[PDB]
Amino acid sequence: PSMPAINTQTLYLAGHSSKLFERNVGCVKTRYLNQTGDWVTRSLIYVFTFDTEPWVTQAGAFQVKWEPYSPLLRVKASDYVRDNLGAKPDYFIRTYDNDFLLLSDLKEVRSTCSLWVTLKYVDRIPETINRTFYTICPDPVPVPFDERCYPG
Ligand SMILES: *[C@@H]1O[C@H](CO[C@@H]2O[C@@H](C)[C@@H](O)[C@@H](O)[C@@H]2O)[C@@H](O[C@@H]2O[C@H](CO)[C@@H](O[C@H]3O[C@H](CO)[C@@H](O)[C@H](O)[C@@H]3O)[C@H](O)[C@H]2NC(C)=O)[C@H](O)[C@H]1NC(C)=O
Ligand SMILES: CC(C)CCC[C@@H](C)[C@H]1CC[C@H]2[C@@H]3CC=C4C[C@@H](O)CC[C@]4(C)[C@H]3CC[C@]12C
Ligand SMILES: *[C@@H]1O[C@H](CO)[C@@H](O)[C@H](O)[C@H]1NC(C)=O
Ligand SMILES: [Cl-]
Ligand SMILES: [Cl-]
């Protein structure tokens, strides 16, 4: 079935547990690139937010595997994405719909969250999604809305 990590729509980071924070790493999103067998190749696009010099758009690739109805998302990250952004080889899928995905850290006990949404919800997340995020995630920090990340 359809789950956002293996679908073609772009996902934008809407929130995360505070412990995950990386200074000057903004406008985080992942685009769908292609698929080979059960592995979907996505890009991780981010902007190096200096104040100043001018902002630097960066892109690294990674692959994901999802067995149908599995609670786990397999992630095969590149060395750059892995070492620089801390991408883990597995994430726990808490819940999702076509327009959102809530992932947790599998190995950590105080399991860090990352909340992802499709373009319609960057300015405002639905009360239901927001309530789930704030209930089950430790130190929930929303990503603030910034028109420079998606001029439109
Ligand atoms: C996303 O959810 C945030 C968390 O909501 C809280 O936790 C949920 C699990 C649920 O229990 C819900 O009922 C809780 O409110 C939202 O943050 C909360 O927003 C409140 C805004 O009214 C805030 O309060 C403020 O306002 C009162 C006046 O009515 C003041 O007296 C008070 O000092 C506050 O300023 C509340 O404290 C806050 N809670 C937390 C834990 O941060 C958030 O708004 C929501 N966002 C969206 C996009 O819906
Ligand atoms: C979205 C799906 C398909 C999988 C994404 C997997 C990887 C690439 C994701 C999962 C959790 C993500 C991290 C979550 C939180 C933060 C803190 C923020 O301040 C900078 C980005 C950063 C560091 C993210 C980088 C990318 C990340 C490691
Ligand atoms: C597409 O897949 C190829 C190999 O299958 C890979 O090199 C590339 O990163 C993917 N993305 C695009 C858009 O080329
Ligand atoms: Cl600024
Ligand atoms: Cl709503």
Author numbering: 2 to 153
Quote the study's own text:
For example, unfractionated saliva from Rhipicephalus sanguineus inhibits dendritic cell maturation and differentiation; Salp15, an Ixodes scapularis salivary gland protein, inhibits dendritic cell secretion of pro-inflammatory cytokines; while Japanin, an 18 kDa protein recently isolated from the salivary glands of a hard tick, Rhipicephalus appendiculatus (the Brown Ear Tick), works through currently undefined mechanisms to block DC differentiation from monocytes and inhibits upregulation of co-stimulatory molecules and pro-inflammatory cytokines in response to stimuli. To provide insight into Japanin’s mechanism of action, we here present two crystal structures of the protein. As was predicted from the sequence, the protein folds as a lipocalin, with an 8-stranded anti-parallel barrel at its centre.
We obtained two crystal structures of recombinantly expressed R. appendiculatus Japanin: (i) a tetragonal form with one copy per asymmetric unit (data to 2.2 Å) and (ii) an orthorhombic one with two molecules per asymmetric unit (data to 2.4 Å), both in complex with cholesterol. In the orthorhombic form, the two molecules in the asymmetric unit form the dimer. The dimer interface involves the 67–75 and 105–112 loops, the 93–99 strand and the 129–141 helix. Figure 2b shows details of the dimer interface between molecules A and B in the lattice, centred around the Phe93A:Phe93B side chain stacking contact, with two additional pairs of hydrophobic residues forming contacts across the interface: Pro139A:Tyr70B and Tyr97A:Ile137B (and equivalent ones due to the twofold symmetry of the dimer, Pro139B:Tyr70A and Tyr97B:Ile137A). Buried in the middle of this hydrophobic patch are the 2.0 Å hydrogen bonds between the side chain of Arg95 on one molecule and the main chain oxygen atom of Ile 94 on the neighbouring molecule. At the surface rim of the interface the Asp98A:Arg132B (and Arg132A:Asp98B) salt bridges are found. In the tetragonal crystals, the same dimer is formed by the asymmetric unit and a symmetry-related molecule across a twofold axis. The dimer is likely to represent the solution species, as indicated by Multi-Angle Laser Light Scattering (MALLS) in solution. All three crystallographically-independent molecules show the same overall structure, and each molecule in the crystals binds one molecule of cholesterol.
